[PDB]
Swiss-Prot record:
It is linked to Hyperthyroxinemia, familial dysalbuminemic: A disorder characterized by abnormally elevated levels of total serum thyroxine (T4) in euthyroid patients. It is due to abnormal serum albumin that binds T4 with enhanced affinity. Belongs to the ALB/AFP/VDB family. It is found in: Secreted. Binds water, Ca(2+), Na(+), K(+), fatty acids, hormones, bilirubin and drugs. Its main function is the regulation of the colloidal osmotic pressure of blood. Major zinc transporter in plasma, typically binds about 80% of all plasma zinc. Major calcium and magnesium transporter in plasma, binds approximately 45% of circulating calcium and magnesium in plasma. Potentially has more than two calcium-binding sites and might additionally bind calcium in a non-specific manner. The record marks 7 as: Not glycated. It comes from Homo sapiens. This is Albumin. The modification Phosphoserine is found at residue 12. Interacts with FCGRT; this interaction regulates ALB homeostasis. Interacts with TASOR. In plasma, occurs in a covalently-linked complex with chromophore-bound alpha-1-microglobulin with molar ratio 1:2 and 1:1; this interaction does not prevent fatty acid binding to ALB. The lineage of its organism: Eukaryota, Metazoa, Chordata, Craniata, Vertebrata. Glycated in diabetic patients. Phosphorylated by FAM20C in the extracellular medium.
Length: 16
């Protein structure tokens, strides 16, 4: 994943 976090794209993720 490049748009989301290194881990599973859950409710908690980076909003680039």
């Amino acid at each position: 994943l490049v748009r989301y976090t290194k881990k599973v794209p859950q409710v908690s993720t980076p909003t680039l």
